[PDB]
């Protein structure tokens, strides 16, 4: 004990940061291969480590298009999050004037918060995850084919090729694990590249709805 806990911390940090890399934010290559002993060097053993503050991270920005667009990652400590803690996060958010942040829960939170997660503000969006999910990166799994989100121009071109109206495309559920991983809202279109049994390849498209 305190070595399994640190192992979990290491793995969840790896996964969250990989997710942020995949969404296209600033991240440094030397962090990617941060080893568990490297984590032990940067962060001490569990009894000396303050969970709700040690792992918080906000260096990530949307450098791909806007270095001035920053985001947050938070690691609450209480088994179930309460209204006070999300208010503390949101007021910290207002002090830093940022629009997006990530939430991780060890077990869950109050239903009152669940209701609140839909109505913070149109300009403030908060995404909820569970510790027992990000402990593995679903994108690395063998049954998950490569998803690649694509811009408005690419979709324009695609549905110009087949003479489609966008609603004739097959759907991907808004709440699906991979869609929620990539953080794509309604009306976006995703390209799937399926691995054939042979060297060939098949392509298909789905609409987020």
């Amino acid at each position: 004990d305190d070595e399994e806990e640190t192992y979990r911390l290491w793995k969840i940090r790896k996964t969250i940061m990989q997710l942020c890399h995949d969404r296209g934010y600033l991240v440094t290559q030397d962090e990617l291969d941060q080893t568990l002993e490297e984590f032990k060097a940067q962060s001490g053993d569990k009894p000396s480590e303050g969970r709700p503050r040690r792992t918080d991270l906000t260096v990530l920005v949307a450098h791909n298009d806007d270095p001035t667009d920053q985001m947050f990652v938070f690691f609450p400590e209480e088994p179930k999050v309460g209204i006070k803690t999300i208010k503390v996060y949101c007021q910290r958010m207002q002090e830093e004037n940022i629009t997006r942040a990530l939430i991780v829960v060890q077990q869950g939170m109050t239903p009152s918060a669940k209701q609140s997660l839909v109505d913070m503000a149109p300009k403030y969006i908060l995404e909820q995850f569970l510790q027992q999910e990000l402990l593995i990166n679903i994108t690395e799994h063998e049954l998950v084919p490569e998803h690649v989100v694509m811009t408005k121009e690419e979709v324009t071109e695609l549905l110009a090729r087949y003479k489609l109206r966008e609603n004739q495309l097959p759907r991907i559920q808004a709440g699906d694990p991979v869609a929620r991983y990539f953080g794509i809202k309604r009306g976006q279109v995703v390209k799937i590249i399926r691995p054939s049994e042979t060297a060939g390849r098949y392509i298909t498209y789905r609409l987020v709805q």
Binding site: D1, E3, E4, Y7
Partner: protein, 107 residues
């Protein structure tokens, strides 16, 4: 174990109302004062403790001796064993082995 009152033949209950605990009836004033200790329970009930410490848990339980496989004999499976049901029945042994693309786990 169960008790019935000699005077009336109904089941006893256990209670305290004075300096010392008592075995008493609910219909007649017969009672026995327990000064000593009796040593047999009803065998209580709580469900299967499976993932008490699931996954690669602590390393204090490491041990030296281990068995080996008859077919391949690769270097990774140290022993473990388990139990059946309750306080008065035997305990079992399984030899599970796992690299990839197979299904082995010997009893």
């Amino acid at each position: 174990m169960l008790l019935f009152c000699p005077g009336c033949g109904n089941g006893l209950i256990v209670e305290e109302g004075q300096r010392c605990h008592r075995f008493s009836c609910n219909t007649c004033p017969y009672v026995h004062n327990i000064t000593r200790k009796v040593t047999n329970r009803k065998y209580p009930k709580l469900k299967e403790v499976d993932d008490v410490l699931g996954g690669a848990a602590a390393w204090e339980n490491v041990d030296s001796t281990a068995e080996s496989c008859p077919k391949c004999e690769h270097p990774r499976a140290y022993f473990m064993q388990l139990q059946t049901r309750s306080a008065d029945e035997p305990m079992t042994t399984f030899y599970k082995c796992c690299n990839a693309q197979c299904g082995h786990r010997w009893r």
